[PDB]
Amino acid sequence: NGLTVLPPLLTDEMIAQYTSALLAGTITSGWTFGAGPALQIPFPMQMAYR
Amino acid sequence: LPFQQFGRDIVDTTDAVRDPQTLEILDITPCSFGGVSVITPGTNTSNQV
Numbered sequence: 321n322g323l324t325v326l327p328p329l330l331t332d333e334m335i336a337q338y339t340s341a342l343l344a345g346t347i348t349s350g351w352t353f354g355a356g357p358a359l360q361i362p363f364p365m366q367m368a369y370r
Numbered sequence: 371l372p373f374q375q376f377g378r379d380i381v382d383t384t385d386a387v388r389d390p391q392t393l394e395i396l397d398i399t400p401c402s403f404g405g406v407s408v409i410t411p412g413t414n415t416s417n418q419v
């Protein structure tokens with residue numbers, strides 16, 4: 321009675337896209353995409369620095 | 371069952387009644403309601419809403 325529920329602004333199908341973008345940026349670029357342009361590096365060469 | 375009259379839910383609101391004249395159960399649902407919101411650009415720009 322007078323008690324509604326409002327839906328969120330971002331659906332699940334968009335949060336999934338953000339998560340996938342984060343994964344694809346941290347797999348093929350290392351940590352470099354968090355400070356500027358994203359740069360390539362092979363994965364066994366990223367793990368060496370880690 | 372052939373001796374109940376009303377119906378009630380987990381929060382104790384009536385949600386089913388049986389008709390006295392013809393013995394049949396009528397489901398009840400409240401009328402629609404909700405909030406109303408107005409979308410507007412600035413009055414410096416337009417007056418459409």
Ligand SMILES: *[C@@H]1O[C@H](CO)[C@@H](O)[C@H](O)[C@H]1NC(C)=O
Nearest residue numbers: 372388389390391392393394
């Ligand atoms: C009440 O009257 C109506 C009209 O004749 C009838 O159909 C109905 O069976 C009556 N109620 C009962 C409990 O018999």
